[PDB]
Ligand binder design. Structure first.
Ligand code: BCB
Ligand code: BCB
Ligand code: BCB
Ligand SMILES: C/C=C1/c2cc3[nH]c4c(c3C)C(=O)[C@H](C(=O)OC)c4c3nc(cc4[nH]c(cc(n2)[C@@H]1C)c(C(C)=O)c4C)[C@@H](C)[C@@H]3CCC(=O)OC/C=C(/C)CCC[C@H](C)CCC[C@H](C)CCCC(C)C
Ligand SMILES: C/C=C1/c2cc3[nH]c4c(c3C)C(=O)[C@H](C(=O)OC)c4c3nc(cc4[nH]c(cc(n2)[C@@H]1C)c(C(C)=O)c4C)[C@@H](C)[C@@H]3CCC(=O)OC/C=C(\C)CCC[C@H](C)CCC[C@H](C)CCCC(C)C
Ligand SMILES: CC(C)=CCC/C(C)=C/CC/C(C)=C/CC/C(C)=C/CC/C(C)=C/CC/C(C)=C/CC/C(C)=C/CC1=C(C)C(=O)c2ccccc2C1=O
Ligand code: HEC
Ligand code: HEC
Ligand code: HEC
Ligand code: HEC
Ligand SMILES: CC(C)=CCC/C(C)=C/C=C/C(C)=C/C=C/C(C)=C/C=C\C=C(C)\C=C\C=C(/C)CC/C=C(/C)CCCC(C)C
Ligand SMILES: CCCCCCCCCCCC[N+](C)(C)[O-]
Ligand SMILES: CCCCCCCCCCCC[N+](C)(C)[O-]
Ligand SMILES: CCCCCCCCCCCC[N+](C)(C)[O-]
Ligand SMILES: [Fe+2]
Lengths: 273, 332, 258, 323
């Protein structure tokens, strides 16, 4: 059940709600009040997916799709089969994600560590809200939101991009992509570096913090350092969505033309036209 | 930089596919007001007296009309094409049967062209049809035409800057960009696809696996054809003031059936109509036009989708004068 | 005919799909998940009594040992036998397997829960060329505070209760990374010194604020063996003490915020 | 809150460390200088830099590639310096537009592109040697260089291997800001929607996964910075409470956990697999699959949807319709 070093950490306390009532483990899993709400929302959400999928045409997991309502239903409730299941499942998803975040807060307090992880996890929750809640509110229908299906959600991303002719020219997207790419590079560099120091090979000795910094000063003239690459990593990753959200929100509510045309602000300055 | 909310949106596919139009109300309203300038139909006249083939001396196309009908046609033509210049744009004051001014002969061919559009191309123009106004908008030179190279501005009523002018070589990339909705695509889709019927627009294979004998080396279409098709599609979209999802489910651009809207099929017929118009009616007019109308390769100005549509999915928001002017088609 | 076609509705890309999944699951399950088990394994149950033979699963889930050759002599092998020796001042609040433990004594001194330290080597962490890594400025005389930043030497240390608890006498610096990790302070009215990690320090221009513990609790901060160097275990002891404060400094901090 | 996780409150200065490598200690040029503002969020020291043969070779070949591109870009605006700055994003150097197959194209239609391709490739190879050899010189493993090798391999796949395999240089990636972007859509269109390429899916999965892992890992280390969790090498060789807490945070959250060493293997593997997966997809594309959407349809994976507006037959296949 327990890791060899675990027992000393398994103390009472650190909860946000309920005190001792839900302050326990089941197997490796800490429960807490938010463990209980998470499971509630998961069970309810997965039930609604099951029921909705059975009323649909197929059981192939690649082809199942629970879709939002037609635009004409605006911000109202829709009949279950034609958007209402999507609406209910969306609420359950938010319930589950927020519960999951708040549970991590409780786990952090018990261990006497920083709350940085749940903080970081707010970012993808926020982005999910941008796609499914905020942007649909600004356009006036839940129908602008994405459908729940393995492949169907890609068809939505696809058409959404082509609604603005070439989405690659969206400046918020350019920022988002750049952070996606540099984050993946940086994780490889950081992971590679640490492994290279601890595993030089051929019975050679484990190297040092000084070797770490020497390697990057040699290769690129600068090393950000041990703590700071972790700060940077969080910053880079978080900015995939923090910058991306602007490009998403802007498309429709604040810009209706193609995204390449947006760059007219630069191209059509009279000085060089 | 930006356009304030709200946006008007429509649905063109199954819910959850993000297919539909996205429109800025102020932009739609400005285009509505521009297009509302379409002059109303002139009052109907009763058909009286002999056909103008017996009355007048040089009537080859509208000979079936009576005098009052025919003079009504001529007043309408003047309003649509040359309201500021008047009847004398095409006519000698002292001899109305003289063909000595070039606009006379061109106008005759335009009458035939317009009749052909409304009779042979109903698959595109339906019961709405076109008149002279659809293209001309009250000037002899239509505001949106194409040469065999790109020109700025798109509206020839605006005055070009030095860089915009076709002779300034440094502005070529910007001339091309603004015809392809500001993309950097390095292809002129007018000369490639709309001036004639030589090129195929379709580039996507219709099989999962590559067929042996078309899939290696010089057997293959170069990737450039895909860039060019995309450039045509950018240009088409901008010319109708819409986006790809008006015609396609982007899941599969190449598929018809449920993967395309009826507007896609209408657009298809539109590509054919424009080719017919350019090859058989508009391009031959370089013989009958002065040199100041021709482009740098001696070409007459020609038509694309914008020529009629001018940034709207239906030209003039579906306004029609077909019933009001039977003599412009359809012809039995 | 078709490039990529094989007999009986098969194609090359279809085969590569299956192969890719096989590679992924192989690397994840057989390699990475075993690399994950180099610490804390084997697991401890309510008394693993079978002393004469090992359970099969416990052997299967472990990788082959690896040996690290340390930079200043010695080797470490993982995974290995590491039971936690020291008596823990903790009692089971219930009979259930996953019920929390309660502190029986003073959890900060007893070093339980968030006050817990790991059993690291009683060894001074070293620089690339053998010197002690973490040392006060009095010893590291060639190191300085950067032009622009607060010199905290002289400033008071205000605890969570708002009481002045002591005065900052020195900063300990990491000579390998050029980074301050601790402040040293005199505990007023106790004739002793105490380290605090910078992460527990709100550095202001006229004071150092510390919300983790009360002023009185600075008395029982783990003492160092030597004045001018620190062991890896002592670093854990010192750091853990303040962390323990986050949950235990007052009775209300362990209870629910709502 | 731990303000140290946001920025360095008090910065330290001291003599500059130099770890000796097995060769090249004299090829380190420049004198180090310090930046107070950089030092808030990072190490204050900038320079020196190592300047070996492979690095110089990389700069030489790279500069040559950059110059070939810039000259061709400048030609595209008839050398007008003002229009060059204006239109920079829209300018590019293109592979052949015509189908010469594998034939060496004319300079006016893709030969300059091919040249710039060669010199970039030599520049990447030379930099790879730098990345590898510097590790060997300092007695470190070559883990970075193998990750970097996968990234270079992916570039070669889209740049020349895929063109070679289908037999047309016309399919290469153009040099330029918007033009390299435009290629993505042309390629996706040509090959029947890249969303339906499983290796696209895998690559994205790993790329998103890198986001997840670096956010989660970065945050984890910051959350245990109080206990020295940033000192990762000695937390591997001598488990501290930092990594015990980190491990238990994740075990109690998701039911299982890594070690401080193994999470770096997870990250390194995820990063590698972005590029490996991408490369496999491009190698299969054109070679063994022509339309990824139709391939998914063939194998029963594609979703289908009802008509909303009426289904629309292909007009080209109606009787008596024109070409
Ligand atoms: C033709 C269509 C295009 C398109 C259309 C597009 C759109 C419409 C949008 C993007 C967006 C984005 N695009 Mg993109 N795109 C991207 C990259 C990206 C991403 C960086 C970015 C953010 C994605 C996102 O919001 O995730 C969202 C992920 C979320 C919300 C994760 C939520 C996690 C949740 C909290 C937890 C879920 C838990 C599970 C259910 C639990 C189950 C677990 C199990 C194991 C127990 C690249 C790298 C490329 C390339 C190489 O060409 C590209 C091309 C295109 N994009 C095409 C040109 N793209 C987004 C953006 O930022 O644009 C500015 C966006 O809105
Ligand atoms: C703005 C653009 C978006 C986008 C664009 C996108 C693209 C372009 C591609 C994907 C793909 C994927 N997306 Mg997706 N996406 C997904 C989930 C997925 C997965 C099915 C897959 C792999 C993701 C991955 O490994 O991430 C990183 C996380 C990792 C590695 C941890 C493991 C996650 C696990 C594999 C997720 C499994 C989810 C379950 C199948 C769903 C829950 C089921 C319930 C009943 C428990 C979720 C759960 C959400 C939510 C809740 O917002 C989301 C939002 C978006 N995606 C936005 C709509 N997505 C890829 C795919 O292959 O699609 C078929 C793909 O190519
Ligand atoms: C309509 C167009 C689409 C498209 C077309 C597309 C294509 C054609 C290809 C991808 C590929 C990929 N797409 Mg993708 N895509 C992606 C994400 C991704 C990437 C994960 C993946 C790998 C590429 C990469 O990391 O390059 C970034 C990393 C690179 C390029 C490595 C560079 C390393 C190099 C050593 C750096 C050296 C530079 C030098 C220093 C500078 C020298 C230069 C000088 C000399 C000139 C997302 C998340 C989405 C969403 C959300 O919609 C999306 C939608 C689309 N993509 C649309 C469907 N996508 C690739 C793939 O996986 O295919 C299967 C791919 O080939
Ligand atoms: C998932 C895997 C990811 C991945 C992985 C990896 N990627 C690595 C490594 C790994 C492991 C390294 O080992 C290596 C490196 O060295 O890192 C420090 C490297 C690289 N990845 C670069 C760029 C990149 N990666 C991209 C993508 C992905 N990568 C994908 C996402 C993309 C995208 C997204 O398009 C781009 C643009 C360069 C910085 C570098 C090559 C330099 C070169 O080949 O020179 C070529 C020669 C030149 C003259 C170019 C000069 C300009 C550049 C910026 C170099 C200047 C440096 C110089 C020291 C500046 C002076 C500063 C001084 C005065 C203070
Ligand atoms: C830039 C910031 C990055 C980021 C950051 C972080 N990410 C974190 C943390 C941080 C810091 C954690 O602390 C937390 C965690 O614990 O790590 C192991 C977590 C997690 N990241 C997950 C998924 C993930 N992260 C993604 C993206 C990024 N992450 C970006 C890149 C993506 C995509 C798509 O890119 C995916 C799929 C889960 C594995 C996990 C949540 C578990 C959960 O919430 O449990 C609770 C909920 C469930 C177990 C199931 C709920 C079922 C609902 C009710 C019914 C289904 C509805 C659903 C909407 C249907 C969709 C269908 C689909 C086909 C469309
Ligand atoms: C039945 C019942 C009533 C239960 C009640 C209890 C309860 C609430 C149970 C929850 C049950 C549920 C819903 C379980 C699902 C758990 C989930 C969401 C699992 C998702 C796992 C996935 C796919 C993770 C993706 C990320 C990934 C690839 C991780 C692998 C590597 C790991 C383990 C990283 C975490 C990790 C990181 C990021 C470190 O930095 C670090 C540093 C030092 C030591 C350890 C670590 C470490 O473990
Ligand atoms: C060019 C756009 C024209 C304008 C403006 C006007 N007319 Fe015209 N007219 C035009 C053509 C091409 C023709 C030949 C028609 C044919 O079917 O072949 C005509 C003809 C006439 C006639 C008949 C003359 C004759 O052959 O005897 C008349 C009487 C006439 N047009 C009069 C007329 C008036 C009054 C106009 C201004 C209100 C006018 N036309 C404008 C071309 C164009
Ligand atoms: C788009 C399909 C058109 C319709 C319908 C009509 N015209 Fe037209 N016209 C069109 C073009 C592209 C051009 C070439 C540009 C040019 O200015 O020559 C023309 C030309 C004319 C002209 C000559 C004008 C001049 O050069 O000064 C005339 C007199 C003219 N067109 C008249 C005309 C009439 C009477 C029409 C209706 C029956 C008509 N046009 C329709 C495009 C299009
Ligand atoms: C209606 C007014 C359309 C809009 C808007 C867009 N497209 Fe289109 N497209 C349309 C038609 C009628 C055709 C067929 C052309 C023919 O002569 O047969 C096409 C074709 C394509 C293709 C090629 C499909 C193939 O079989 O190879 C592609 C890739 C394509 N279209 C894409 C596309 C994009 C990206 C668009 C928005 C920028 C777009 N099209 C708009 C009709 C219409
Ligand atoms: C004038 C000769 C035209 C040219 C050139 C093009 N189009 Fe057109 N189009 C025209 C008319 C008169 C109409 C009918 C409007 C109506 O009320 O029915 C249309 C219609 C379309 C449509 C359908 C729009 C809808 O149903 O909402 C589309 C999609 C369309 N046209 C596209 C299109 C394209 C792509 C063209 C260039 C190849 C093009 N049209 C040329 C008139 C004329
Ligand atoms: C045998 C011989 C003859 C044939 C084989 C030759 C060979 C191996 C060719 C290989 C060619 C390859 C791999 C080509 C790949 C091309 C690719 C992937 C290009 C991609 C992107 C290009 C971009 C972004 C170009 C940008 C260009 C510019 C910004 C102008 C140059 C100036 C710069 C300052 C570069 C900055 C780039 C960036 C850091 C911002
Ligand atoms: C394909 C890359 C070709 C580049 C050739 C130029 C690089 C020279 C390499 C010298 C390496 C010397 N060494 C091993 C001592 O580092
Ligand atoms: C991101 C795209 C994901 C598409 C996944 C489709 C893979 C289909 C493979 C099916 C395997 C073969 N079979 C026999 C089951 O059909
Ligand atoms: C699309 C990319 C797929 C990435 C798959 C990696 C998922 C990690 C699996 C963790 C499994 C945990 N456990 C305990 C069952 O081994
Ligand atoms: Fe790390």
């Amino acid at each position: 059940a327990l890791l060899s070093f675990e027992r000393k950490y398994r103390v009472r306390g650190g909860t946000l709600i309920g005190g001792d009532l839900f302050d326990f483990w089941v197997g490796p899993y800490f429960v807490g009040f938010f463990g209980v709400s998470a499971i509630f929302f998961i069970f309810l959400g997965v039930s609604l997916i099951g029921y909705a999928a059975s009323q649909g045409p197929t059981w192939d997991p690649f082809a199942i799709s629970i879709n939002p309502p037609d635009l004409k239903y605006g911000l109202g409730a829709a009949p279950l089969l034609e958007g209402g299941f999507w609406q209910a499942i969306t609420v359950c998803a938010l319930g589950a994600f927020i519960s999951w975040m708040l549970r991590e807060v409780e786990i952090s307090r018990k261990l006497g560590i920083g709350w940085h992880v749940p903080l970081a996890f707010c970012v993808p929750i926020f982005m999910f809200c941008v796609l499914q809640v905020f942007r649909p509110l600004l356009l006036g229908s839940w129908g602008h939101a994405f459908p729940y299906g393995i492949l169907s959600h890609l068809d939505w991303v696809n058409n959404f991009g082509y609604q603005y002719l070439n989405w690659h020219y969206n400046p918020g997207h350019m920022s988002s992509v750049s952070f996606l790419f540099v984050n993946a590079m940086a994780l490889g560099l950081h992971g590679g570096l640490i492994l290279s120091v601890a595993n030089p090979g051929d019975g050679d000795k484990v190297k040092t913090a000084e070797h770490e910094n020497q390697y990057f000063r040699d290769v690129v003239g600068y090393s950000i350092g041990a703590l700071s690459i972790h700060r940077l990593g969080l910053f880079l990753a978080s900015n995939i969505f923090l910058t991306g959200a602007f490009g998403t929100i802007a498309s429709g509510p604040f810009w209706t033309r193609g995204w390449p045309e947006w760059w007219g602000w630069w191209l059509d300055i009279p000085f060089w036209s | 930089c930006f356009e304030p909310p709200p946006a008007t949106t429509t649905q063109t596919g199954f819910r959850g596919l993000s297919m539909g139009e996205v429109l800025h109300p102020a932009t739609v309203k400005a285009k509505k007001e521009r297009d509302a300038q379409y002059p109303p139909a002139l009052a109907a006249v009763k058909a009286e007296g002999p056909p103008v083939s017996q009355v007048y001396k040089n009537v080859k196309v509208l000979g079936n009309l009576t005098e009052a009908e025919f003079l009504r046609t001529m007043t309408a033509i003047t309003e649509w094409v040359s309201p500021q210049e008047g009847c004398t744009y095409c006519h000698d004051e002292n001899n109305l049967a003289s063909e000595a001014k070039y606009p006379y002969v061109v106008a005759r061919r335009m009458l035939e062209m317009t009749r052909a559009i409304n009779t042979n191309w109903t698959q595109h123009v339906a019961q709405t049809g076109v008149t002279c106004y659809t293209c001309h908008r009250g000037t002899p030179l239509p505001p949106y035409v194409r040469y065999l190279e790109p020109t700025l501005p798109l509206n020839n009523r605006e005055t070009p800057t030095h860089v915009e002018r076709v002779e300034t070589r440094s502005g070529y990339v910007v001339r091309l960009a603004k015809y392809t909705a500001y993309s950097a695509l390095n292809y002129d889709p007018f000369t490639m696809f709309l001036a004639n019927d030589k090129r195929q627009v379709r580039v996507v294979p219709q099989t999962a696996l590559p067929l042996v004998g078309v899939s290696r080396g010089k057997e293959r279409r170069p990737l450039s054809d895909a860039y060019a098709t995309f450039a045509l599609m950018m240009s088409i979209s901008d010319s109708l003031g819409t986006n790809c999802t008006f015609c396609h489910n982007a899941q599969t651009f190449e598929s018809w059936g449920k993967k395309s809207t009826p507007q896609r099929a209408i657009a298809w017929w539109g590509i054919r109509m424009v080719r017919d118009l350019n090859m058989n009616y508009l391009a031959p007019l370089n013989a009958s036009l002065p040199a100041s109308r021709l482009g740098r390769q001696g070409e007459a100005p020609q038509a694309d989708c914008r020529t009629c549509h001018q940034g709207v999915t239906k030209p003039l928001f579906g306004a029609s004068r077909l019933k009001d002017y039977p003599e412009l088609g359809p012809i039995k | 005919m078709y490039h990529g076609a094989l007999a009986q509705h098969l194609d090359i890309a279809q085969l590569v799909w299956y192969a890719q999944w096989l590679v992924i699951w192989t690397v994840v399950l057989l390699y990475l998940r075993r690399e994950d088990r180099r610490e804390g394994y084997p697991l401890v149950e309510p008394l693993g009594l079978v002393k004469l033979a090992p359970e099969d699963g416990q052997v299967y889930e472990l990788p082959y040992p690896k040996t690290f050759v340390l930079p200043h002599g010695g080797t470490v092998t993982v995974p290995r036998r590491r039971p936690e020796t020291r008596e823990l001042k903790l009692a089971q609040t219930d009979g259930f397997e996953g019920a929390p433990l309660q502190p029986t004594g003073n959890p900060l001194v007893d070093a339980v829960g968030p006050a817990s330290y790991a059993e690291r080597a009683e060894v001074v962490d070293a620089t690339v060329d053998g010197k002690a890594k973490i040392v006060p400025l009095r010893v590291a005389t060639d190191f300085s505070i950067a032009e622009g930043d607060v010199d905290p030497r002289g400033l008071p240390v205000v605890a969570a209760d708002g009481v002045e608890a002591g005065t900052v006498t020195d900063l300990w610096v990491d000579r390998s990374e050029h980074y301050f990790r601790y402040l040293e302070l005199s505990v007023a009215g106790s004739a002793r010194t105490a380290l605090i990690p910078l992460g527990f320090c709100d550095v202001k221009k006229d004071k150092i604020v510390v919300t983790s513990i009360l002023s009185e609790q600075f008395a029982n901060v783990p003492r160092l063996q030597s004045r001018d160097q620190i062991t890896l275990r002592e670093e854990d002891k010192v750091s853990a003490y303040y962390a323990g404060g986050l949950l235990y400094a007052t009775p209300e901090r362990a209870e629910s915020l709502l | 809150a731990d303000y140290q996780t946001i920025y360095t409150q008090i910065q330290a200065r001291g003599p500059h460390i130099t770890v000796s490598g097995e060769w090249g200690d004299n090829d380190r040029v420049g004198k180090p200088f310090y930046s107070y503002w950089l030092g808030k969020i990072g190490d204050a020291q900038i320079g020196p830099i190592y300047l070996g043969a492979s690095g110089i070779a990389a700069f030489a070949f790279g500069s040559t590639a950059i110059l070939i591109i810039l000259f061709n870009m400048a030609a595209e605006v008839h050398f007008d310096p003002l229009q060059f700055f204006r239109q920079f994003f829209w300018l590019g150097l293109y592979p052949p537009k015509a189908q010469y197959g594998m034939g060496i194209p004319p300079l006016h239609d893709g030969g300059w592109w091919l040249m710039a391709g060669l010199f970039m490739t030599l520049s990447l190879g030379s930099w790879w040697i730098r990345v590898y050899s510097r590790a060997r010189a300092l007695g470190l493993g070559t883990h970075i260089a193998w990750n970097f090798a996968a990234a270079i391999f992916f570039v070669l796949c889209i740049g020349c291997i895929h063109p070679t395999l289908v037999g047309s240089w016309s399919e290469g990636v153009p040099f330029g800001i918007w033009p390299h972007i435009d290629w993505l859509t042309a390629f996706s269109i040509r090959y029947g929607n890249f969303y339906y390429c499983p290796w696209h899916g895998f690559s994205i999965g790993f790329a998103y996964g890198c986001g997840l892992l670096f956010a989660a890992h970065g945050a984890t280390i910051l959350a245990v910075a109080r206990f020295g969790g940033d000192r990762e090498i000695e937390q591997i060789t001598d488990r501290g409470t930092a990594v015990e807490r980190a491990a238990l945070f994740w075990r109690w959250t998701i039911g299982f956990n890594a070690t401080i060493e193994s999470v770096h293997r997870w990250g390194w593997f995820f990063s590698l697999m972005v590029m490996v997966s991408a490369s496999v997809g491009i190698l299969l594309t054109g070679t063994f699959v022509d339309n990824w959407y139709l391939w998914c349809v063939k194998h029963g994976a594609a979703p289908d949807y009802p008509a909303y507006l009426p289904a629309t037959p292909d007009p080209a296949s109606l009787p008596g319709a024109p070409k």
